[PDB]
């Protein structure tokens, strides 16, 4: 679990969005596993606007932060789960690191700010949904 709070927006994994997230929907994209909802309070976070490929992510299954080198956002095949059929997820970045399903929502950050959130994983792999292209989050 986990979310990004910037301005009057809350960014979450679309597969973990609540009834309240859907009732205050701003934008969602099943192909990116992202959902953004509106908030009444002003949010705590800043979004990176960069091309960093190194950063640090929070891993809830270890209560620890880990450094990672990650690929550029791309279209990656993702196996079928209880939430989605087998499909290509877009704007996804992969890295070597520990992750478990409950780790989705953990923030990936670089020196410039929030880069994205955990969205997929595998045997010694972890995937992050990029948010750096969503320029409207800052306005
Ligand atoms: C951090 S999530 C994770 C981690 C390790 C895992 N190992 C083995 C198998 C699955 C793992 C898994 N789950 C995962 O990738 N998906 C299920 C939830 C929705 C995700 C999506 N964005 O389509 C795909
Ligand atoms: Zn950066």
139 Cα: distance to centroid of ligand 1 (angstroms): 31
CB distance 56 to ligand 1 below 6 Å: no
CB distance 102 to ligand 1 below 6 Å: no
Three-state SS string over the chain comes to: CCCEEECCEEEEEHHHCCHHHHHCEEEEECCCCEEEEECCCCCCCCECCCCCCEEEEEECCCCEEEEEEECCCEEEEECCCCCCCCEEEEEEEEEECCCCHHHCCCEEEECCEEEEEEEEEECCEEEEEECCCCHHHHC
Distance of CA 59 to CAs 42, 111, 133, 137, Å?
Answer: 25, 18, 24, 24
Distance of CA 14 to CAs 34, 94, 97, 124, Å?
Answer: 5, 18, 22, 23
Closest Cα partner for 134 from 4, 16, 18, 21?
A: 4
Residue 14 buriedness (CB in 10 A; 0-12 / 13-18 / 19+): buried
Residues 6+ apart with CB under 8 A from 103: 59, 60, 61, 118, 121, 126
Instruction: Say if strands 87-96 and 125-130 run parallel, antiparallel, or are unpaired.
Output: antiparallel
| Residue with tokens 């927006």, as numbered in its chain | 9
CA 66 distance to own-chain centroid = 16
71 Cα: distance to centroid of ligand 2 (angstroms): 13
| Resolution value, angstrom units | 1.5
């Amino acid at each position: 679990s986990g979310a990004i709070y910037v301005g009057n927006y809350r960014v979450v994994n679309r597969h973990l969005a609540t009834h309240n997230d859907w009732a205050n929907l701003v934008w969602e994209d099943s192909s990116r596993d992202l959902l953004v909802s509106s908030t009444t309070a002003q949010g705590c976070d800043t979004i990176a606007r960069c091309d960093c490929q190194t950063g640090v992510y929070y891993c809830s299954s270890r209560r620890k932060h880990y450094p990672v080198s990650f690929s550029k956002p791309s279209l990656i095949f993702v196996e079928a789960s209880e939430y989605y059929p087998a499909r290509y997820q877009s704007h996804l970045m992969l890295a070597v690191g520990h992750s478990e399903p409950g780790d989705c929502g953990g923030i990936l950050r670089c020196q410039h700010g929030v880069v994205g959130i955990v969205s997929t994983g595998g045997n010694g792999l972890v995937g992050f949904a990029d948010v750096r292209d969503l320029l409207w989050l800052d306005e």
